[PDB]
RNA sequence: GCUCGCUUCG
């Protein structure tokens, strides 16, 4: 029912425990993203009944 | 992050890239970050009784 | 056709609420305004 | 020794509110009008017969509406709710259907269920499905249990018919002429005439003027014509008082100089004066004498009605009106038309009665037409009406009526328009003040500025602050929180105690009675019941019976001591109000009554009825004395106020300390909050409208007033709190406008989600064929669909989940081009947006026309910025002028930084401390974990929040030491910081930011078009030429005005002066003399404009050397 | 609809602290020694999870299912 | 090809092709919704 | 696309 775009607003307000010294800023585009200067969350809930 | 009901499903992944707080509030580290001066109370005369 | 290259790529794309139908070649306009 | 006070007294109200209130005047009426009025309506016309082939009757017996359901199976009925009839377009109604009995070849035929019509059932009715629900049983429904309902829905819109104001009938008002001239004016009506009759006093003598009349007559043949041939009668009659008969000599005089003087000679001399209603069919046989007598005895005076030909009540009346217009012609005791005692609501249920009537009417008149033209003429076989019975009239009638908003009942010869508007969905509390809206009668058009004025008399009725600010000032008017409006009663019991508490017959005794100082006369809803000395005792009695529930509790009694009459209202419309009864400096209400109330031992109906709680009317209230608080009780007081927050209305419960704020301030916000974005319902999420607004992270405001709490508004806000800070910061705040917080705005401040929709129709025509959509056209090149068709799924119509651009295709529709193998032509619907869009869902239904109804629900997730306009919950709107960084922003000893910087500079120019007051409470509750309340007159104190600011350890008055943010050094003066309930409002600059290229033109007239939506241009006005002539700009205004709007190439005779083409003459057959010029395109037109009217403008022209 | 996870105007993560304030409102706790308990000192924080209102349960009750 | 949509109260996948009266198997109502693209979309987390 | 009505906006 949350709204996709809301929903991307709150998983960006969650803080990641990483460490920022050991990353680099990505280049301007490159939306793929390397492994150096991005990390990957998956996130897969399936809610049914009991 | 949000409720679900049974039939509903969140399926995502998530790309995190390193950034200053400048751009997003998002990449603020600290929650509350602040000064005060030290303040330094003094008697003018000698206050004494109720 | 298009009136300059000849071509028969008319398509009508509106720019910014302009009906008018150009070539998608060289971009020459054929028709516009409805 | 103060008097004691009863702290629970404001109890009272919530325990009105649950049987009466906000909503359930149209609700009780609508129930009132389907259960009862229209059984009088189907009984006055029980009987339809035809003139033509005698002994044939259509008799109906019973009529029912029953359950609302959908004519979509074939021939069956099913159960809808109103959220399906809101998503499929079509109409929430319920079957009228009727049993009858008639004769087809003299033998009696009966039909038990016949149905004949469709009458849109109005939401929380009694035959409504939301009726006795439960909030579960809501959801299983797909409706809102906070919604109040009370409208109808038709073809899938909202519909609400606001309550209409008028003047009150049968009632003298005495006014001054445009000459200055005091006249007196008696609008008569009955249930089937209104007739205004009038009486002026332009030569010093009084003159009757009536429609029916060709020429006004003078009073005194009227009087005679009446009956009472004497003169001295008359003036006895008319008054005793010296003044009264040097006024009404002239009138003597000139009934003298003519030889009128008995009641045949007047009755001829108003005949005389009487016009036929062209040629009106049917043989006069000398009717002259006759028509007068029907004319003084059924049109002039309708509601004094008359046993057989006996004028004596008449007689009285206009003699008591001739002694009201001379004792105004003194002392300028002239009665006001603003005055609300005078004034009547009618709800929903009588104007659906009304037409109901009419739709009735108008179908029986068909169906005898039908029979007059079938029956004599066809066969031996037998005519019955259930062959011609059509049932689409009464249900078009009503949906068109409803839908349109334009109400014309010729038998009424009422021509009424706006009746009913698109209820509004911006938020609840606008919907929810939109349902207890009341219209003018004067139907705003020009500057009356009469009525736009706040009269004394809306206190307790109406709500002060609530009106539109605009056009619409003062005539569009909110009722208040605790209001009722009465019905009619039967009247029986009512002439029955006033004939037996003393009141003398009228005809017993002559009209010196009338003359007396202690005689006071008794009306009756305009008819004169009678006199009375010593009018005191019957009031009180009138009263105490009134109390003790002999006599209705509706029914009001006034006295006018200057006019000495005794008014008993007991038609429905008037406005009453609940008041406890002071009896002897004490209230009847005490502590342990309210402790009953509040355990549940007794109810409203009990106050009610133990003569505690009564209602009173604006008449009634007029001659009574009101205390508003214990404390104010002296020797003479009658009544009590039950709360006196109850004056403001809905909109107004929302302002915080509203008393410590200036009016247009209220006015403001109410305007403002009627705009506020937020929360609908619980069913927002599956509800599908043309433009809707969310917000993201709604929260209830931390000072809620009681009124918030009683219509549960926390339970759906429309707003955020924010920690706001009351300084100049950068200067881009100069003129109302503040400053945003970047990182607060990051972190979801303010954010705000709108849905559109966008809905196409697949429908069958008259010919096999239908509208069929295409899939994706694939391109070959990259067997991909191209750009615009790529976000369309296999079936072709867009799938949910997907961002649309602009100029993109949501349904590939294409449809026939025949009405031998059938052409389709493409009308795909396009997306017209400036932004992108993302696709929520996608409805599609089906209609009993075979018609596909899909409708699409694109959302838009959109971030304050620049140009968004902000409330703040006491009228002081504004606009974001600067979006500064976290850490440019101030900070306090604690690390707070505010949200909104707003301009001190707007406080002093609008006084508002209701502000203030509103951020101290809210800080301090915020604080201590409380919600402070800003009840109006009331609420909690500041030195309570005071106390709680000093009591947690900050400022007492929420001035903090707070160090600048840019610079790193402490500010000279303390910041007012503290949470402020700000509310977005649904104005944005997205929206409204327009340009406009070349584009397109009208045809008529070859200049931009009007509208955004239509991609229209601005318009220079009069006023901005105006401006450019004093600046002498020529070249400019030419070049706006000619080159860029309408600019043309035309062809001009030289020879005969008229408009060529293509350098060519018609008319002189030549092209020597043909030279071009430029010439706007307006002007053209208005050149063959003129030279079609015959006013051939002839061009001379000439070299520009 | 739902408690935001991050406070407006300091930034204090307060969407983890929601449930368990309802807990405290299940609990005989009021509303200041709560908030008091959870660990806000500033009152934005306070705001934030006393002003809120739970409508995303509200709104599942209207949901598909 | 198989079209697939979802009812209004039982929520069921149902598969129609063109030119079908809009209904639903085991109930009758007539209000028919269009399931969720399969197709990647990206969205940005300002 | 024409018209009208309501509604808001300053
Ligand atoms: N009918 C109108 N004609 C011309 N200008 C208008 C009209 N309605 C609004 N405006 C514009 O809005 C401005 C009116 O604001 P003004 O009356 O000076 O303040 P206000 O609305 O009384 O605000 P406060 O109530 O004093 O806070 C001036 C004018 O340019
Ligand atoms: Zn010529
Ligand atoms: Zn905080
Ligand atoms: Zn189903």
Redesign the interface.
């Known amino acids: 029912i949350v709204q996709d775009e809301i929903l991307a607003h709150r998983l960006g307000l969650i803080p990641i425990h990483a460490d920022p010294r050991l990353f680099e800023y990505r280049n301007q585009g490159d939306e793929e993203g390397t492994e150096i200067d991005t990390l990957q969350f998956r996130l897969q809930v399936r809610c049914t009944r009991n | 992050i949000a409720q679900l009901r049974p039939g509903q499903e969140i399926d995502l992944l998530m790309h995190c890239v390193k950034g200053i707080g400048k751009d997003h509030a998002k990449f603020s580290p600290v929650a509350t970050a602040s000064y005060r001066l030290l303040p330094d109370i003094t008697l003018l005369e000698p206050v004494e009784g109720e | 056709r298009c009136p300059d290259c000849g071509s028969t790529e008319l398509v009508e794309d509106?720019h910014?609420?302009?009906?008018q139908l150009v070539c998608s070649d060289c971009g020459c306009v054929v028709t516009e305004?409805? | 020794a103060p008097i004691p006070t009863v702290e629970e007294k404001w109890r009272l109200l919530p325990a009105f509110l649950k049987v009466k209130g906000l909503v359930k005047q149209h609700i009780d009426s609508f129930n009132y009008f389907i259960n009862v009025e229209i059984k009088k309506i189907m009984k006055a016309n029980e009987k339809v017969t035809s003139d033509a082939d005698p002994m044939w009757y259509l008799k109906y017996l019973n009529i029912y509406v029953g359950l609302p359901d959908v004519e979509e199976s074939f021939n069956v009925t099913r159960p809808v709710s109103p959220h399906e009839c809101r998503l499929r377009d079509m109409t929430y109604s319920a079957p009228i259907t009727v049993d009858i009995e008639y004769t087809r070849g003299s033998q009696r035929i009966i039909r038990n269920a016949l149905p004949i019509g469709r009458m849109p059932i109005m939401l929380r009715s009694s035959n409504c499905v939301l009726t006795g629900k439960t909030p579960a049983e809501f959801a299983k429904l797909n409706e809102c249990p906070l919604d109040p309902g009370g409208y109808f829905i038709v073809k899938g819109v909202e519909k609400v018919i606001l309550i209409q104001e008028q003047l009150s009938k049968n009632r003298i008002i005495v006014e001054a002429d445009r000459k200055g001239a005091v006249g007196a004016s008696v609008t008569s009506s009955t249930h089937e005439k209104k007739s205004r009759t009038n009486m002026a006093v332009k030569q010093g003598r009084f003159y009757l003027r009536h429609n029916t009349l060709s020429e006004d007559i003078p009073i005194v043949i009227i009087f005679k014509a009446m009956g009472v041939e004497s003169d001295q009668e008359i003036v006895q009659m008319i008054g005793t008082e010296e003044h009264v008969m040097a006024a009404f000599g002239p009138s003597l005089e000139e009934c003298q100089k003519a030889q009128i003087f008995t009641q045949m000679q007047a009755l001829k001399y108003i005949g005389n004066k009487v016009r036929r209603q062209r040629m009106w069919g049917g043989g006069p046989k000398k009717t002259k004498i006759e028509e007068a007598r029907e004319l003084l005895a059924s049109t002039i005076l309708t509601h004094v009605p008359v046993k057989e030909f006996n004028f004596r009540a008449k007689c009285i009346y206009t003699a008591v009106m001739v002694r009201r217009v001379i004792l105004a012609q003194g002392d300028n005791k002239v009665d006001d038309r603003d005055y609300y005692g005078n004034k009547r609501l009618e709800l929903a249920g009588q104007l659906l009665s009304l037409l109901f009537e009419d739709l009735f009417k108008k179908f029986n008149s068909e169906m005898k037409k039908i029979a007059d033209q079938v029956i004599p003429k066809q066969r031996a076989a037998q005519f019955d009406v259930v062959k011609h019975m059509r049932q689409d009239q009464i249900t078009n009638g009503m949906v068109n009526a409803i839908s349109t908003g334009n109400w014309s009942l010729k038998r009424f010869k009422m021509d009424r328009q706006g009746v009913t508007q698109v209820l509004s969905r911006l938020s609840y509390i606008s919907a929810l003040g939109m349902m207890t809206r009341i219209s003018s009668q004067f139907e705003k058009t020009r500057k009356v500025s009469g009525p736009r004025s706040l009269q004394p008399s809306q206190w307790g009725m109406l709500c002060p602050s609530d009106t539109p600010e605009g056009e619409a000032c003062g005539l569009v008017k909110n009722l208040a929180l605790m209001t009722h409006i009465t019905t009619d009663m039967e009247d029986g019991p009512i002439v029955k105690l006033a004939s037996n508490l003393g009141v003398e017959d009228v005809n017993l005794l002559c009209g010196e009675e009338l003359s007396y100082p202690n005689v006071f006369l008794v009306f009756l809803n305009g008819n004169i019941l009678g006199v009375i000395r010593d009018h005191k005792k019957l009031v009180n009695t009138f009263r105490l019976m009134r109390r003790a529930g002999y006599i209705n509790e509706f029914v009001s009694i006034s006295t006018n001591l200057t006019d000495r009459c005794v008014y008993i209202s007991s038609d429905g419309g008037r406005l009453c109000r609940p008041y406890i009864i002071v009896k002897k400096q004490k209230p009847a209400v005490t502590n342990k009554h309210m402790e009953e109330l509040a355990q549940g031992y007794r109810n409203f109906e009990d106050f009610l009825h133990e003569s505690l709680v009564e209602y009173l009317d604006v008449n009634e209230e007029n001659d009574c004395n009101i205390a508003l608080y214990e404390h104010t009780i002296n020797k003479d007081t009658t009544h009590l106020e039950i709360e006196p927050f109850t004056l403001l209305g809905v909109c107004a419960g929302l302002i915080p300390y509203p008393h410590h704020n200036q009016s247009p301030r209220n006015t403001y916000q109410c305007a403002m909050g009627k705009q506020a974005m937020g929360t609908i319902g619980y069913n927002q999420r599956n509800r599908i409208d043309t433009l809707m607004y969310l917000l993201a992270y709604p929260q209830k405001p931390m000072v809620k007033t009681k009124t918030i709490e009683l219509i549960e508004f926390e339970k759906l806000p429309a707003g955020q709190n924010a920690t706001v800070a009351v300084m100049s910061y950068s200067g881009y705040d100069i003129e109302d406008a503040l400053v945003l917080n970047k990182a607060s705005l990051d972190r979801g401040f303010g954010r705000c989600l709108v849905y559109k929709n966008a809905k196409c129709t697949l429908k069958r025509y008259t010919n096999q064929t239908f509208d069929k959509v295409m899939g994706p056209m694939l391109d070959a090149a990259t067997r991909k669909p191209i750009w615009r068709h790529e976000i369309l799924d296999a079936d072709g119509i867009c799938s949910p989940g997907e961002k649309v651009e602009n100029k993109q295709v949501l349904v590939n529709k294409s449809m026939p081009t025949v009405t031998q193998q059938p052409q389709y032509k493409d009308v795909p619907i396009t997306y017209k947006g400036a932004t992108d869009s993302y696709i929520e869902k996608v409805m599609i239904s089906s209609n009993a026309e075979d018609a596909f109804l899909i409708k699409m629900l694109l959302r838009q997730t959109r971030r304050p910025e620049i140009g968004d306009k902000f409330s703040s919950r006491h009228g002081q709107k504004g606009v974001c002028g600067l979006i500064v960084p976290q850490e440019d922003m101030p900070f306090c000893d604690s690390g707070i930084c505010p949200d909104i910087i707003m301009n001190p500079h707007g406080f002093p120019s609008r006084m508002t401390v209701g502000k203030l007051i509103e951020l101290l409470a809210g800080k301090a509750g915020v604080l201590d974990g409380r919600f402070h309340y800003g009840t109006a007159f009331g609420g909690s104190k500041v030195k309570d929040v005071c106390e709680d600011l000093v009591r947690h350890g900050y400022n007492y008055l929420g001035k903090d030491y707070v160090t600048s943010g840019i610079t790193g050094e402490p500010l000279e003066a303390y910041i007012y910081f503290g949470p402020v309930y700000y509310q977005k409002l649904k104005h944005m600059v997205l929206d409204k930011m327009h340009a406009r290229a070349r584009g397109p033109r009208a045809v008529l007239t070859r200049q931009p078009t009007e509208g955004r939506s239509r991609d229209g241009g601005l318009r220079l006005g009069e006023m901005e030429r105006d401006c450019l002539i004093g600046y002498g700009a020529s070249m400019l205004l030419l070049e706006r005005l000619m080159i860029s709007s309408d600019a043309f190439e035309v062809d001009v005779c030289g020879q005969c002066g008229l408009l060529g083409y293509s350098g060519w003459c018609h008319y002189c057959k030549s092209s020597c003399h043909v030279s071009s010029l430029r010439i706007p395109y307006a002007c053209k037109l208005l050149f063959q404009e003129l030279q079609s009217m015959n006013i051939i403008p002839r061009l001379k022209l000439s070299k520009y050397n | 609809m739902i408690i935001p996870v991050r406070c407006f105007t300091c930034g204090k993560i307060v969407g983890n602290k929601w449930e368990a304030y309802l807990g405290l409102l299940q609990a005989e706790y009021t509303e200041g020694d709560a908030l008091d308990a959870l660990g806000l000192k500033r009152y934005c924080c306070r705001r934030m999870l006393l002003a809120h209102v739970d409508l995303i349960e509200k709104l599942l009750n209207y949901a598909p299912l | 090809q198989p079209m697939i949509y979802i009812c209004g109260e039982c929520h069921t996948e149902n598969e129609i092709k063109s030119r079908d009266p809009i209904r639903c198997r085991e109930c009758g109502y007539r209000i028919m919704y269009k399931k969720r693209t399969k197709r990647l979309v990206v969205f940005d987390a300002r």
């Not at chain 3, 910014?16 to 009906?19: D, F, H």
Request: charged share 0%; aromatic share 14%.
């Open positions: 509106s910014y609420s302009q009906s305004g409805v």
